[PDB]
Amino acid sequence: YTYDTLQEIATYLLERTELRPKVGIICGSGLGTLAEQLTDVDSFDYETIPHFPVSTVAGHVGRLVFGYLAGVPVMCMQGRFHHYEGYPLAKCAMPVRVMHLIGCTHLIATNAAGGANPKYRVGDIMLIKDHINLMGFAGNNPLQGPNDERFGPRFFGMANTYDPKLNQQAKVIARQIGIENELREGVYTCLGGPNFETVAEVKMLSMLGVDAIGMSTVHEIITARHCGMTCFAFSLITNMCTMSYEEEEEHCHDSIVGVGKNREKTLGEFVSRIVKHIHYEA
Amino acid sequence: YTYDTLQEIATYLLERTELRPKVGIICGSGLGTLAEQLTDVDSFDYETIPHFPVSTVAGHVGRLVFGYLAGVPVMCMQGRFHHYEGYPLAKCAMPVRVMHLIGCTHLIATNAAGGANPKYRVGDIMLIKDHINLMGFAGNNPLQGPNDERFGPRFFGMANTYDPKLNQQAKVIARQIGIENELREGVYTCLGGPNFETVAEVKMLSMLGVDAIGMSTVHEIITARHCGMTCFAFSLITNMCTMSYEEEEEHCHDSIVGVGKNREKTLGEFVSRIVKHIHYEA
Amino acid sequence: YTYDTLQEIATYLLERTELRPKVGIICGSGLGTLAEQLTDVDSFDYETIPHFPVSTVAGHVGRLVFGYLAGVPVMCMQGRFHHYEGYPLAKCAMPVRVMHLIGCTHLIATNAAGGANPKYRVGDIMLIKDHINLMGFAGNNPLQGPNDERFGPRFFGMANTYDPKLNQQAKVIARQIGIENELREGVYTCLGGPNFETVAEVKMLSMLGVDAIGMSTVHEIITARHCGMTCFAFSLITNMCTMSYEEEEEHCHDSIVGVGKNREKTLGEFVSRIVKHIHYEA
Numbered sequence: 014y015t016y017d018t019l020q021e022i023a024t025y026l027l028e029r030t031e032l033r034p035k036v037g038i039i040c041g042s043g044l045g046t047l048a049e050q051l052t053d054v055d056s057f058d059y060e061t062i063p064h065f066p067v068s069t070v071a072g073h074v075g076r077l078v079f080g081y082l083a084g085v086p087v088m089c090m091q092g093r094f095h096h097y098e099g100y101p102l103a104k105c106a107m108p109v110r111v112m113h114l115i116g117c118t119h120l121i122a123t124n125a126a127g128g129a130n131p132k133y134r135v136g137d138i139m140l141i142k143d144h145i146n147l148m149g150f151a152g153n154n155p156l157q158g159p160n161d162e163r164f165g166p167r168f169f170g171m172a173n174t175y176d177p178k179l180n181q182q183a184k185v186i187a188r189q190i191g192i193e194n195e196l197r198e199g200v201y202t203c204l205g206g207p208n209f210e211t212v213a214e215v216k217m218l219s220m221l222g223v224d225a226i227g228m229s230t231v232h233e234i235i236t237a238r239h240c241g242m243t244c245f246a247f248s249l250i251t252n253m254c255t256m257s258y259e260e261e262e263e264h265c266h267d268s269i270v271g272v273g274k275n276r277e278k279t280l281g282e283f284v285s286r287i288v289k290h291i292h293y294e295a
Numbered sequence: 296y297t298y299d300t301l302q303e304i305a306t307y308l309l310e311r312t313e314l315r316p317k318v319g320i321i322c323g324s325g326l327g328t329l330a331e332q333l334t335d336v337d338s339f340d341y342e343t344i345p346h347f348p349v350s351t352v353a354g355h356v357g358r359l360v361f362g363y364l365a366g367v368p369v370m371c372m373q374g375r376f377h378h379y380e381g382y383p384l385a386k387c388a389m390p391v392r393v394m395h396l397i398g399c400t401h402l403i404a405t406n407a408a409g410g411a412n413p414k415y416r417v418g419d420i421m422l423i424k425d426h427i428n429l430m431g432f433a434g435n436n437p438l439q440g441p442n443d444e445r446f447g448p449r450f451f452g453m454a455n456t457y458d459p460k461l462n463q464q465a466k467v468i469a470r471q472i473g474i475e476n477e478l479r480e481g482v483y484t485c486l487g488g489p490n491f492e493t494v495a496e497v498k499m500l501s502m503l504g505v506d507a508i509g510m511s512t513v514h515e516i517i518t519a520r521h522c523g524m525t526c527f528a529f530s531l532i533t534n535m536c537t538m539s540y541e542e543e544e545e546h547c548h549d550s551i552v553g554v555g556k557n558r559e560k561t562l563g564e565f566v567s568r569i570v571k572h573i574h575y576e577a
Numbered sequence: 578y579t580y581d582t583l584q585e586i587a588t589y590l591l592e593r594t595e596l597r598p599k600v601g602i603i604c605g606s607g608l609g610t611l612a613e614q615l616t617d618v619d620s621f622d623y624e625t626i627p628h629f630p631v632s633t634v635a636g637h638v639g640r641l642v643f644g645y646l647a648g649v650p651v652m653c654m655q656g657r658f659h660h661y662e663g664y665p666l667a668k669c670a671m672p673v674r675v676m677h678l679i680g681c682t683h684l685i686a687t688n689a690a691g692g693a694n695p696k697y698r699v700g701d702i703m704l705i706k707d708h709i710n711l712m713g714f715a716g717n718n719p720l721q722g723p724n725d726e727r728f729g730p731r732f733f734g735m736a737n738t739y740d741p742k743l744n745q746q747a748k749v750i751a752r753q754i755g756i757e758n759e760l761r762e763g764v765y766t767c768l769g770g771p772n773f774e775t776v777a778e779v780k781m782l783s784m785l786g787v788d789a790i791g792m793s794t795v796h797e798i799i800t801a802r803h804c805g806m807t808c809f810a811f812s813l814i815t816n817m818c819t820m821s822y823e824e825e826e827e828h829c830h831d832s833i834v835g836v837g838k839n840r841e842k843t844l845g846e847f848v849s850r851i852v853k854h855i856h857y858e859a
């Protein structure tokens with residue numbers, strides 16, 4: 014994906030919707046119903062958009078929806094792309110660069126995750142304060158290759174990547190809507206997958222300071238920071254990681270999506286208030 | 296590798312052998328003599344099987360041996376494929392899909408490993424109870440890409456991957472044949488190699504909970520679990536990891552292969568009786 | 578990059594300089610002025626060398642300089658190649674195989690790094706005593722693929738990779754030139770980049786025993802060891818890693834390169850005394 018190609022995707026969309034969102038939202042496993050709450054919608058199935066990858070995972074509808082979320086224009090990825098589907102991280106992160114070119118100044122990244130922190134409960138929302146990019150340590154980063162200064166600088170720091178003020182405002186909101194007890198804040202990691210983690214892997218990740226284990230988001234976030242966007246992200250805790258050889262393990266994708274589906278009203282209200290906050294501060 | 300190509304390999308072999316084994320065995324460095332103890336054998340050089348990779352590593356003979364191991368039909372990879380040879384993990388693990396299509400319900404994977412646990416000794420057999428897939432964390436996984444459901448599900452859990460009942464029976468067997476003082480049980484990891492680990496690496500890997508350090512196996516067993524195969528695995532400790540800047544280090548592939556070669560009797564007997572337990576249990 | 582191609586490159590240079598150096602030097606970020614202290618130079622822009630990558634990083638000049646360092650013939654990479662540029666590790670490390678083919682017995686690898694050890698100070702030189710190759714754990718190694726025995730063995734051990742005796746002489750030189758308090762010794766790791774590390778990543782890397790965090794060197798050293806070369810390496814600490822969500826982060830490539838430029842006299846004297854030691858001892 015060159016700059017020119019990405020700008021063709023952006024123009025393609027800007028000619029076909031009048032909406033000019035300042036916020037992009039990526040909906041993960043069981044979070045796709047965020048997109049169903051928008052009004053005055055212009056919708057584009059991924060398989061119809063030039064150069065666009067398709068979502069092959071169940072519960073990822075595969076649709077870019079422009080609409081109003083409680084009156085605020087947003088761009089919504091209803092469905093994400095994952096490295097385990099065979100997509101390089103630059104390709105999974107490509108919509109973030111499209112968002113940036115469309116004029117989004119903010120990225121809200123959303124995902125399902127397993128709770129490696131044993132104090133978490135299924136159904137909790139964990140604010141991502143930080144991440145550990147293991148893929149990146151190994152050389153697998155979406156920014157590898159020639160750098161285009163029209164997007165951003167060759168090198169950049171990660172301080173405040175997960176915006177501290179939006180994280181603090183999300184705590185204020187959680188308490189307004191009565192979900193503070195189901196609200197966490199901690200560290201996310203993105204692993205290859207598609208298999209889930211062994212007991213030894215979960216022990217190692219957790220001792221290194223990981224609270225939530227998923228398979229996305231980090232490379233999306235790094236692409237967003239590269240081009241100057243403000244990021245906010247959260248994990249819905251859809252299952253607890255297996256902590257012992259003694260525990261019965263029942264990890265199931267359908268149940269994992271189910272967790273989010275059953276919380277669609279609360280998630281929608283939560284994201285809706287975050288977006289409201291971003292809009293009024295601007 | 297498509298399901299159709301793999302089925303073609305399976306059909307090619309099944310047309311050239313009368314044997315219908317329920318157990319695939321993979322022999323690692325110094326374990327190649329397991330194949331030599333089979334009776335009434337149909338043997339296939341890797342060079343001659345369609346689409347098959349070749350063993351380039353010393354002590355890896357490079358042939359697929361169907362035969363009887365104490366009267367039980369087995370198929371045996373005499374020599375394996377390593378990622379450091381330049382094969383993608385899916386290519387290294389492809390024989391597991393062939394075993395499955397042939398009708399193997401069980402995979403026994405064997406390997407050489409450096410002992411990172413300083414309680415171990417050269418010549419110990421360490422039952423693999425669990426692994427840590429650092430390659431998979433970084434996105435290097437044999438299941439990356441489109442998922443064929445004729446093999447297995449998109450996602451799956453890792454609990455009980457190294458079958459607990461078979462590890463238990465291996466402890467029983469170790470007692471029967473006098474080797475309980477050379478029998479450990481612990482956590483394996485598969486590194487890229489082909490260089491051996493530095494002192495700082497070994498310390499980091501111990502602290503994360505690794506007992507045995509190798510360069511194979513993990514993706515073979517991930518491929519088997521995806522197929523729904525039951526897995527049993529062990530490492531022969533062929534050398535102790537260097538643990539200080541003061542220890543003299545003498546890691547040598549020829550010596551490493553020799554550790555297994557000098558234990559062929561015991562290894563054959565140990566593996567033969569696990570296979571026997573599997574046969575009797577169906 | 579085959580042996581024959583590498584010999585093409587070696588022969589190309591050997592035809593165009595009469596210098597026969599025994600020591601190769603790679604200059605990293607802020608260390609390029611080392612090449613400027615050479616006398617009687619034959620200089621080659623990377624652009625003009627057959628099959629050579631080019632340096633795209635600010636402050637990496639991109640010239641191979643054959644010259645005298647205080648009377649000792651050296652071969653000096655003024656600027657290097659990084660994986661985040663899009664170069665595979667074997668391509669970043671390729672100039673090390675050329676140095677060997679030319680007759681270099683020693684590699685001096687220098688880099689800039691972030692101080693993860695909080696007792697380090699900006700401007701310190703950390704001798705590399707060891708490294709943790711996280712790229713290699715995942716399978717990203719310059720030696721992956723067929724092995725040519727004309728360079729070295731399939732497998733080899735890492736003990737004393739960073740030469741203990743040269744590290745000892747460095748400590749003696751440090752006191753001779755008045756920089757003993759600014760001399761450290763510890764463990765280096767090579768991350769993919771190009772972004773710098775999160776707070777959570779720096780914490781995890783410290784915990785695992787890393788003192789200095791960089792993006793180069795490790796694969797150059799592994800290639801050198803493969804060839805049988807003696808290796809000496811150090812990091813100039815150009816910035817402290819961010820260790821808290823409360824500190825102000827000002828990671829800047831221009832400043833980083835500036836730390837070395839501001840120390841060119843010292844760096845040159847230090848390196849010049851090491852080469853003088855290698856030369857006398859031989």
Ligand SMILES: O=c1[nH]cnc2c(C[N@@H+]3C[C@H](CO)[C@@H](O)C3)c[nH]c12
Nearest residue numbers: 042125126127226227228266269450
């Ligand atoms: O326990 C886990 N480990 C890794 N990822 C997840 C996720 C996140 N998603 C959900 C989905 C498979 O259910 C895949 O895209 C990763 C939920 N739970 C876990």
Ligand SMILES: O=c1[nH]cnc2c(C[N@@H+]3C[C@H](CO)[C@@H](O)C3)c[nH]c12
Nearest residue numbers: 324407408409508509510548551732
């Ligand atoms: O100390 C070790 N580190 C990593 N792997 C091994 C192995 C396993 N095999 C042995 C073989 C090189 O001797 C290569 O295929 C990996 C034995 N000892 C060690």
Ligand SMILES: O=c1[nH]cnc2c(C[N@@H+]3C[C@H](CO)[C@@H](O)C3)c[nH]c12
Nearest residue numbers: 168606689690691790791792830833
């Ligand atoms: O804090 C750090 N983290 C990772 N690498 C470096 C380096 C080494 N170089 C410097 C350069 C970016 O300034 C890139 O080539 C990596 C200096 N400081 C840091």
